[PDB]
Tab-separated table of C-alpha atoms and ligand atoms in Angstrom:
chain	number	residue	atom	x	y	z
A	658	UNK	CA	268.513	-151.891	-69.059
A	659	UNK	CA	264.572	-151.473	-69.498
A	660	UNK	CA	263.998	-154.766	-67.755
A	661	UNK	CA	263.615	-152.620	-64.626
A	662	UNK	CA	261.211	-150.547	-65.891
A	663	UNK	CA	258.860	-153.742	-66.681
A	664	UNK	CA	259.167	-154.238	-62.771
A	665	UNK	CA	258.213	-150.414	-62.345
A	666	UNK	CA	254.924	-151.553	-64.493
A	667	UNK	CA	254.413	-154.353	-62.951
A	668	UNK	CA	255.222	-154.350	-59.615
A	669	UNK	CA	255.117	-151.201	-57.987
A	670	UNK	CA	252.393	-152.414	-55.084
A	671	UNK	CA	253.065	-156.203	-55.295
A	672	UNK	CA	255.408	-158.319	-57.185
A	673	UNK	CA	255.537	-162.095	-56.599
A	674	UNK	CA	258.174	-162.027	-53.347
A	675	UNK	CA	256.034	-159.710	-51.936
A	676	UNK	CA	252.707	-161.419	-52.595
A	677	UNK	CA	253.800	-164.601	-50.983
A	678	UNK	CA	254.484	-163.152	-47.838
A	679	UNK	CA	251.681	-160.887	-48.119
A	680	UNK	CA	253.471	-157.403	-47.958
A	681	UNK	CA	252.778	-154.685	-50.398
A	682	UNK	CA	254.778	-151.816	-50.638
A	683	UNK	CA	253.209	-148.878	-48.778
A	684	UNK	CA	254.843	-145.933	-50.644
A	685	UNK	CA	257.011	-145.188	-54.409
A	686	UNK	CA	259.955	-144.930	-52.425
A	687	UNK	CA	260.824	-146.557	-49.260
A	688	UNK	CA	264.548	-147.774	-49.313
A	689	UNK	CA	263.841	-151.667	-47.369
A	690	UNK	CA	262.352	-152.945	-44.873
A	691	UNK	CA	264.973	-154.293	-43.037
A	692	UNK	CA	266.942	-157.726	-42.466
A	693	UNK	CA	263.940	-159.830	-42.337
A	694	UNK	CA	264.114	-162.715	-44.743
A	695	UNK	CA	267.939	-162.247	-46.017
A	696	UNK	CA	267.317	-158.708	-46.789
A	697	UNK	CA	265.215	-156.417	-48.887
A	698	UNK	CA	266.701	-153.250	-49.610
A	699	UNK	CA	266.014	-152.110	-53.024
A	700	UNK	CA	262.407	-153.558	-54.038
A	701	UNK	CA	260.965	-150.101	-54.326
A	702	UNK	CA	259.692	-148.174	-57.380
A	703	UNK	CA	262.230	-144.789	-56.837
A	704	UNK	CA	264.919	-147.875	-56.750
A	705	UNK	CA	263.734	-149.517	-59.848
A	706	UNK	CA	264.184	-146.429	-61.315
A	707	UNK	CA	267.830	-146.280	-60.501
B	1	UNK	CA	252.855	-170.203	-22.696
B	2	UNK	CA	252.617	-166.740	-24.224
B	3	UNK	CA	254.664	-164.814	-26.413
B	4	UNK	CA	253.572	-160.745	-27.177
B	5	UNK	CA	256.036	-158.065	-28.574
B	6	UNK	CA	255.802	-154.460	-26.677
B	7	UNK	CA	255.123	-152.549	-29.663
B	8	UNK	CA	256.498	-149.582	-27.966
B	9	UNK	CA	259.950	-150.822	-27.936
B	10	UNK	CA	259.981	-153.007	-30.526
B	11	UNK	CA	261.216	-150.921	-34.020
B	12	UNK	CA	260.210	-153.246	-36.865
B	13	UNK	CA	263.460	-155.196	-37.543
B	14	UNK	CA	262.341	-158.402	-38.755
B	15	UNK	CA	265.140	-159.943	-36.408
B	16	UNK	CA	262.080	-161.829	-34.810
B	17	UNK	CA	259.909	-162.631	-37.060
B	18	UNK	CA	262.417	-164.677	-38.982
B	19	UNK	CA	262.139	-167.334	-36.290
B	20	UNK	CA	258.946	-167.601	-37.318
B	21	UNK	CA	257.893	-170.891	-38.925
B	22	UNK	CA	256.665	-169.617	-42.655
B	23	UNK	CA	253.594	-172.392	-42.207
B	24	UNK	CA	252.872	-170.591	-39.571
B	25	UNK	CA	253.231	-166.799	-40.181
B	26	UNK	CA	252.543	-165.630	-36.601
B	27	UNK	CA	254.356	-162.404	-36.590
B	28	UNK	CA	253.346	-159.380	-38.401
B	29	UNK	CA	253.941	-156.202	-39.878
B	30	UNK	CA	251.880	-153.095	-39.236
B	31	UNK	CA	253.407	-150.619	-42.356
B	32	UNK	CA	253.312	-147.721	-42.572
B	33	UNK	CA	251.117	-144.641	-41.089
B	34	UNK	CA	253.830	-141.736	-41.600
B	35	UNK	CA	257.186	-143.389	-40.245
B	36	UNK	CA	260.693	-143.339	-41.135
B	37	UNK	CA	261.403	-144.671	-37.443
B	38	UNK	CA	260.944	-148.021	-36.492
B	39	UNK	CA	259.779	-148.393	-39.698
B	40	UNK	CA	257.055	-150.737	-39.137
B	41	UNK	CA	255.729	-152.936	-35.600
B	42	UNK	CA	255.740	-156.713	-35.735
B	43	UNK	CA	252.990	-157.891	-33.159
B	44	UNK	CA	252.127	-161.412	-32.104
B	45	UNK	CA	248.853	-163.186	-33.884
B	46	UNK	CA	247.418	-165.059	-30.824
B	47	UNK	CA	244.970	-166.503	-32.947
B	48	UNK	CA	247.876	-168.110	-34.772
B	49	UNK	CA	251.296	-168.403	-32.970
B	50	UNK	CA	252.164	-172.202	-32.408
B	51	UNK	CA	254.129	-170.854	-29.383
B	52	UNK	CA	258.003	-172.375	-30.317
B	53	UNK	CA	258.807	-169.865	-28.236
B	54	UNK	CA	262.373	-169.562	-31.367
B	55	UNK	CA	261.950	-165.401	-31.056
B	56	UNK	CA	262.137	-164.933	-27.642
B	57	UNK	CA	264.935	-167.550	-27.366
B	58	UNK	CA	266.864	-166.131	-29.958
B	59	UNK	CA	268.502	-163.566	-28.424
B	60	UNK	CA	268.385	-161.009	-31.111
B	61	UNK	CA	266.035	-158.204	-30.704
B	62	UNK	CA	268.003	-154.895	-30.088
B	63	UNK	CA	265.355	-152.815	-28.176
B	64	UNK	CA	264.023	-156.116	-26.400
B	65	UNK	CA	260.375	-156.646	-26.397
B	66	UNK	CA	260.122	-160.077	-27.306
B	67	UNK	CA	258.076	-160.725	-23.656
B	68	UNK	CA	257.437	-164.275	-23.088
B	69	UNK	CA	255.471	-165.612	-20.176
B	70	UNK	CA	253.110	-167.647	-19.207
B	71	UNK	CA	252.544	-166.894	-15.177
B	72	UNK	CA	254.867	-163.784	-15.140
B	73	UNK	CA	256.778	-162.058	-17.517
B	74	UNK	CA	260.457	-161.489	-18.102
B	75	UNK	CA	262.418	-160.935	-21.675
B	76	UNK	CA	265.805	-159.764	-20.255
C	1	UNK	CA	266.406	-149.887	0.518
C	2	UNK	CA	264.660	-146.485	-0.312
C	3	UNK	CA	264.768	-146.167	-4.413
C	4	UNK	CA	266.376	-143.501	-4.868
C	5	UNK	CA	263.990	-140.932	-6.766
C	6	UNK	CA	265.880	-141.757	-10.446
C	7	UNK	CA	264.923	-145.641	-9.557
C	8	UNK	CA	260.727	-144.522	-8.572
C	9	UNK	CA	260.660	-142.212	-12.202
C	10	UNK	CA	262.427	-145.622	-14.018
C	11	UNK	CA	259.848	-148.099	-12.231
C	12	UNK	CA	256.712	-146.029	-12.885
C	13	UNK	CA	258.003	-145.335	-16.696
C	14	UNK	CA	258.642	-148.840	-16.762
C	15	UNK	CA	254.832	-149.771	-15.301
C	16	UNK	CA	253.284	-147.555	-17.387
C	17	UNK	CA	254.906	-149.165	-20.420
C	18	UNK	CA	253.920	-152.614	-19.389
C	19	UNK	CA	250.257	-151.243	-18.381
C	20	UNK	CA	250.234	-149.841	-22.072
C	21	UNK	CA	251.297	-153.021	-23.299
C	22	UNK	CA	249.328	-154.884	-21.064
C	23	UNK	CA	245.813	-153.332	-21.922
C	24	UNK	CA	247.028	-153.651	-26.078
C	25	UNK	CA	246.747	-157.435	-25.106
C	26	UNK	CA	243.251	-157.678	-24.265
C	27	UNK	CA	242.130	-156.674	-27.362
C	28	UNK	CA	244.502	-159.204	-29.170
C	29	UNK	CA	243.453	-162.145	-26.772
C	30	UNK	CA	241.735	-165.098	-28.394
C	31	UNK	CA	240.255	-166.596	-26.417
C	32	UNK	CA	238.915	-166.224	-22.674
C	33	UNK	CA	241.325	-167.700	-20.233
C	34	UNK	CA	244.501	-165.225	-22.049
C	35	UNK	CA	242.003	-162.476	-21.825
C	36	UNK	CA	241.336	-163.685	-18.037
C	37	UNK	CA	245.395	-163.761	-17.699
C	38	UNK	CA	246.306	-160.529	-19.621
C	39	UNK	CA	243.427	-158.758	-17.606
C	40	UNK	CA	245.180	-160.096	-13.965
C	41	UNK	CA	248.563	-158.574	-15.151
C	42	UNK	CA	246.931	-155.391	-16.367
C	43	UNK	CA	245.157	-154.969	-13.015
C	44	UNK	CA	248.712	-155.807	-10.847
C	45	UNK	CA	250.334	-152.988	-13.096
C	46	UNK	CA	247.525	-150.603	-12.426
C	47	UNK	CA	248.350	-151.630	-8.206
C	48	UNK	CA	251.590	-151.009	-9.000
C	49	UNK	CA	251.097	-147.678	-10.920
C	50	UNK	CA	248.800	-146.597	-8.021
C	51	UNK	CA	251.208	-147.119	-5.133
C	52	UNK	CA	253.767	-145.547	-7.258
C	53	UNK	CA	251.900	-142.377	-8.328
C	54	UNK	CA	252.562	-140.528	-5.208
C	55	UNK	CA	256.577	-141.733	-4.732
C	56	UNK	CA	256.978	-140.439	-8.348
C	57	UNK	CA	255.002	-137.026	-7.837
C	58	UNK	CA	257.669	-136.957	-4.857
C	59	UNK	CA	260.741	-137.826	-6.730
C	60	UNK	CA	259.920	-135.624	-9.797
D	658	UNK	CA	292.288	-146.705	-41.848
D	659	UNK	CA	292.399	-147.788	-38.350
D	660	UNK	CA	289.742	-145.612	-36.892
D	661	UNK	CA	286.729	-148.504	-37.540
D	662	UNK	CA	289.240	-150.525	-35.621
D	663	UNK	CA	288.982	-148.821	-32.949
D	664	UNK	CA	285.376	-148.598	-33.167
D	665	UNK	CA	285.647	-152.391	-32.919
D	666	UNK	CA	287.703	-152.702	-29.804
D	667	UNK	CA	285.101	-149.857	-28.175
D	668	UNK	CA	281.738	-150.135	-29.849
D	669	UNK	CA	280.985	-153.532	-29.956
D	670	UNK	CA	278.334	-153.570	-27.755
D	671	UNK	CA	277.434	-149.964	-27.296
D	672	UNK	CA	278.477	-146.997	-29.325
D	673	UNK	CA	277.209	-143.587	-28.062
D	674	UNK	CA	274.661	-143.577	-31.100
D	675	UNK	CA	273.075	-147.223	-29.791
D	676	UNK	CA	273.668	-146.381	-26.060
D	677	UNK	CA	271.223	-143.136	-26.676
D	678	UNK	CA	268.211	-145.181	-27.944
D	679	UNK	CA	269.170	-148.247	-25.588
D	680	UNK	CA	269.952	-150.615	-28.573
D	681	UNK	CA	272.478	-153.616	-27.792
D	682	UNK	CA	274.288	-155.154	-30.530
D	683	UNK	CA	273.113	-158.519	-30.337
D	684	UNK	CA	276.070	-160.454	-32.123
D	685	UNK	CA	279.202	-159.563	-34.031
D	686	UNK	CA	277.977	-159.971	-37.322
D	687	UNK	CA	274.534	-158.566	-38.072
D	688	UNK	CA	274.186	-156.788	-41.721
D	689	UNK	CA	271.684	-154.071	-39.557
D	690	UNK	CA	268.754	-153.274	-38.177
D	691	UNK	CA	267.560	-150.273	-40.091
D	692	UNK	CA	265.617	-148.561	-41.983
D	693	UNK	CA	264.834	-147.400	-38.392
D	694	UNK	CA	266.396	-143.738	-37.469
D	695	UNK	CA	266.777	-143.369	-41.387
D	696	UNK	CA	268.557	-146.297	-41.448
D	697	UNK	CA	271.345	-148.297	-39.615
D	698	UNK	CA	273.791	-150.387	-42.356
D	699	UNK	CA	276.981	-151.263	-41.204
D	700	UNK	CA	277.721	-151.137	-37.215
D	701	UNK	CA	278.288	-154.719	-35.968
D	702	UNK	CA	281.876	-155.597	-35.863
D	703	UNK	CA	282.280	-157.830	-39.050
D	704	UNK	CA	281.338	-154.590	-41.302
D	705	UNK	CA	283.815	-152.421	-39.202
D	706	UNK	CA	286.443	-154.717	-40.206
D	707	UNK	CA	285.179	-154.716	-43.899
E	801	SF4	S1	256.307	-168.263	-30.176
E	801	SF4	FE1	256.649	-169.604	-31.988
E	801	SF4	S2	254.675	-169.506	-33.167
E	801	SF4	FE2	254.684	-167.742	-31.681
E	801	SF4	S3	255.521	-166.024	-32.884
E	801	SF4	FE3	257.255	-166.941	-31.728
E	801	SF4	S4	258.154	-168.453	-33.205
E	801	SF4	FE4	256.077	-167.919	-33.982
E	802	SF4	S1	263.446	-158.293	-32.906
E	802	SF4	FE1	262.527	-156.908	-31.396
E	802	SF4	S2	262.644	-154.853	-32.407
E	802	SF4	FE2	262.899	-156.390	-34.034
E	802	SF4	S3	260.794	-156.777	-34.873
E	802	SF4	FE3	261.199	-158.327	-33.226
E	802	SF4	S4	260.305	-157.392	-31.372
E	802	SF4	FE4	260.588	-155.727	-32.868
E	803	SF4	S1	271.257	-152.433	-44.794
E	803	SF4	FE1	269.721	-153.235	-46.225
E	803	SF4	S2	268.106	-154.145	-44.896
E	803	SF4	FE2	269.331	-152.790	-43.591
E	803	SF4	S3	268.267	-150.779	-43.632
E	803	SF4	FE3	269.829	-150.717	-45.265
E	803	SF4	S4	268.769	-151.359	-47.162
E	803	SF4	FE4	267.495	-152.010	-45.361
């Protein structure tokens, strides 16, 4: 369960998928980005939380 | 050959810039400046794009704006 | 075949939108002879724009 | 239960929702688009039938 909020701590701006690609996540609570690369719905802090 | 994305049409799928060759990296992503819409733009790096000329052969790009020319343009 | 004035409105949207594209281009050109080649299409869209501009005053 | 399949045998190029932005589905089985328009999950053909 609290596993998540590590990723909350740790990644809320980068996390290593994101760092590789260089992306960065530009708000707390987008829901995705889209299709690109298989898929990335979900990566967000606000989605974390849930 | 040349390869550019109007970033008008385009609405930041990622349908294109999957083609693109990882090594290479030549699409983009613009994020976010207050936009639920499109979401982000994906624009061409000249100063990096191999030209494979995969995106614009692909097919999928739902608005169309993967451009390709060289001499005179035409996507579809 | 006159374009009717629905076809003159699409063509000069459509111009515009490849002039605004166009000109975006020259700034991300790197090097001279695709700045010399985006520049020659940017020019024939502002021709076409030009010679449009009164047919689409006319059909809007 | 049969409405999406009827959205299949119609929409699977156009529905009135794509053919008002000018969007083209560009195969039968894309997982979407989105998060364009506030998003887009679930319109090509394959997730109609799902
Ligand atoms: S033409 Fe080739 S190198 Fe250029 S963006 Fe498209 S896939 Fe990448
Ligand atoms: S497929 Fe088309 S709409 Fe999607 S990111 Fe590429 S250019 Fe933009
Ligand atoms: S289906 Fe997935 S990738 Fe597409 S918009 Fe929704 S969360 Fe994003």
């Amino acid at each position: 369960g609290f596993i998540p909020l590590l990723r909350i701590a740790f990644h809320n701006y980068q996390s290593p998928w994101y760092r590789d690609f260089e992306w960065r996540k530009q708000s707390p609570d987008f829901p995705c980005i889209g299709p690109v690369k298989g898929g990335t719905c979900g990566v967000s802090i606000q989605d974390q939380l849930w | 050959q040349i390869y550019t994305i109007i970033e008008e049409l385009c609405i930041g799928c990622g349908f294109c810039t999957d083609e693109c060759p990882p090594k290479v990296n030549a699409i983009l992503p613009r994020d976010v400046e207050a936009v639920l819409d499109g979401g982000e733009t994906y624009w061409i790096d000249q100063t990096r794009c191999i030209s494979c000329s995969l995106c614009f052969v692909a097919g999928t790009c739902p608005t169309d704006a993967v451009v390709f020319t060289e001499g005179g343009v035409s996507r579809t | 075949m006159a374009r009717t004035p629905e076809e003159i409105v699409k063509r000069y949207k459509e111009a515009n939108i490849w002039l605004r594209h166009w000109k975006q281009q020259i700034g991300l050109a790197k090097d001279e002879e695709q700045r010399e080649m985006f520049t020659q299409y940017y020019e024939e869209r502002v021709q076409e724009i030009a010679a449009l501009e009164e047919p689409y005053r006319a059909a809007l």
